[model samples]
Target: GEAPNQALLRILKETEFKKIKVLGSGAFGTVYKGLWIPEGEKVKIPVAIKEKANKEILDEAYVMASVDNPHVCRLLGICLTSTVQLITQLMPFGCLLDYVREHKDNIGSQYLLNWCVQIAKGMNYLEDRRLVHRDLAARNVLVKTPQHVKITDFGLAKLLEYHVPIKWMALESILHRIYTHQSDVWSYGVTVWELMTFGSKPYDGIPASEISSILEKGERLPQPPICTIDVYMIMVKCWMIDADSRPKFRELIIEFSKMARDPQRYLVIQGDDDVVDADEY
Candidate 1:
């Protein structure tokens, strides 16, 4: 853990590991297909490679170590060296961002309900452990398969200590005035909106500084077809003006379950739908 996968490439070659495929990339670095072979007849395979490490990387590892659950990604080990790296199992279905974009043509209310339900379960588990996944966007919610979702990208994670760094956070995260668990709930609502709209970018075209004013005036994006009345109610609760008014992750999980079970019953086009608003784009 000290240096973290600094010698990932070296370890792979020396250990007779083979590269499988290119998984994805991010600002810090890229992920790759990797595997290790043992002396015995059986071969041990690793799905993904962790190739980036920095001050933020170290913090991500520390935060992930505190969370151990099936709904979350599994960190295999750290290969410490000049460049720190963290190795993890791959999600075969890729991330939610890719899933939404690729399946844009086929997505409907059922697909939306299932995907968000899995996300809610994972987030609820994290909240139960008192962990806040500060970066709860579509990119971080990985789709392991058609029926499974895993919460990843721990670079901005923090514990729910009440005195979170809310001041410099993105406008939506900061306005709540605290970085308690509810901040993730706010992000969760945004993620739902993205799912309904094929992962549309938030605050696009608007300067980062102006986001506060826009959201403070009771503004919201138009509700997508997938957003049922129950879902909108839950999103409203999550994005409540007062941070304390936001629902806990556990409560959200229950609400998501209901949406999945009775999607049509809960879905209803409401008056002056936020999704139809022009300025929100």
Candidate 2:
């Protein structure tokens, strides 16, 4: 049950969801889709529960609980009776990377632009709070509805706590483990590349160990075939070696807002013969 002006807690008693199933699993934990029947409540509420080792994982929960935004995943509550778990709002469509890749041909530019705007807005919220999402990628962003995206998995310390994909990391984080809001801006650029490429691996074919050397030599991820010149330009700015050169999330939000206003004019498709208008979707 929720307490006024405090972190929410749910007391579990008896039967769990009949349809409980694991949605995804990683080194840290497994996320399950299920329903919970609160005490005295007849109707069950749909939720996503993340079960993790009973070690102190409360810091991430505290960070998530402090936030309340439409573009950020809602942390419903925490359960600590039997096993440590986090309950959050269910995202029907799943991770943005998987969704975009599986539906590449079916998706249009307008939908992608809509997602970009939503993500930018979410990051802007985090930036305003001075929180750095050290790991920001399409896989970290979840799709709530067809055109709606929510930034998730923040403050999890995925790189330090689990597997580290060096390519998605900024040079400073890779070399010194120092993270800042600006570093997040760098990851946001890589995420934009992922969207344009429909989930292609960043720095494909290049061994992870060689990424730092490649980056140090002033090389950046190549422009995706479908990315327009203007959009690619923004990505270039994000990859600047000078962290201060990267635009803040608030600036990104303003840029995406303008693109959302006239998507047809700015959402240009390059290197594709089938130039379909996203409106058709």
Candidate 3:
């Protein structure tokens, strides 16, 4: 149980980062913000240390190590022993969901667009790598800055999985165990609603047991207050009943990019008869 990756072993052997405080807790482990000062460098590198009771941390560590991109959080190393700890690049601003909730009324359209684009680009990277984020949601997106976001918390993710997130999952994910890029797109749509409404819980008044039936009947969440029609259209596309009809992450990236260039040009069209009314359900 002591064997860790050679690189990780070298890091644990080299120096011990000082744990500052507990950042958060989850089913897998407790995460802490830690500070490390390399032997030769005077600067300190802030990292997120996720401590797990068993070897489960290694699973997440290996998953993060497989991807190399600015949009995805980086895994620095691991401390393998009776209890495993994963060292990952720290996201200073916390998760996107909480950040949006905290600054809901104050966030500008441009800021929302920036985060949307950042998430799309990150998801595009995952799509290209053929990795399916089984648990794609706002809570899994980490904020590096007001404008920059990185996808994290791969603990619940899988290249493929039979698991489910009742509110955020696609229909196929629930009934067929088909976790794919398209399924991720479905979750992304819910995330857009979260961003637009500044982190309001999806299907708020609806019971979890009813969500599957509601979705089956072609019902969806009401339009978010701050979202533009064009952006809302993208979210609707992502939630298409047919997985094949869902837009690819790259398509979303291009769409968000255009919105970023001239955000004012896109306006929320009113009185669209075609928009799904949550009341119909």
Find the candidate with the highest TM-score and give its number: 3
User: 255 in model 2: Cα distance from truth in Å?
Assistant: 0.8
Residue 146 displacement in candidate 3 (angstroms):
0.7
> What TM-score would every model get versus the actual structure?
0.80, 0.85, 0.87
lDDT tens readout by residue for model 3, 1-281? 33343433324532557889999886766889886555554556777788733545666776787777778887777776557778777788999999989976677777778788888898899877667877888999998778778999787666534345789999888777778888899999999889888889999888888888999999988877656678888999998999989999988889988897876555332321222111111
Predicted structure 2, TM vs. truth: 0.85
Off by over 4 Å in 3: 1-11, 160-163, 267-281
Instruction: List lDDT for all candidates, in order.
Output: 0.66, 0.76, 0.78
| lDDT by residue for model 1 (129-162), tens | 6777777888787766667777898877776545
Q: What is the lDDT of residue 28 in candidate 2?
A: 70
Tell me the spans in candidate 1 whose CA falls farther than 4 Å from its real position: 1-16, 38-41, 162-172, 175-177, 267-281
Model 3 weakest 10-residue run by lDDT: 272-281
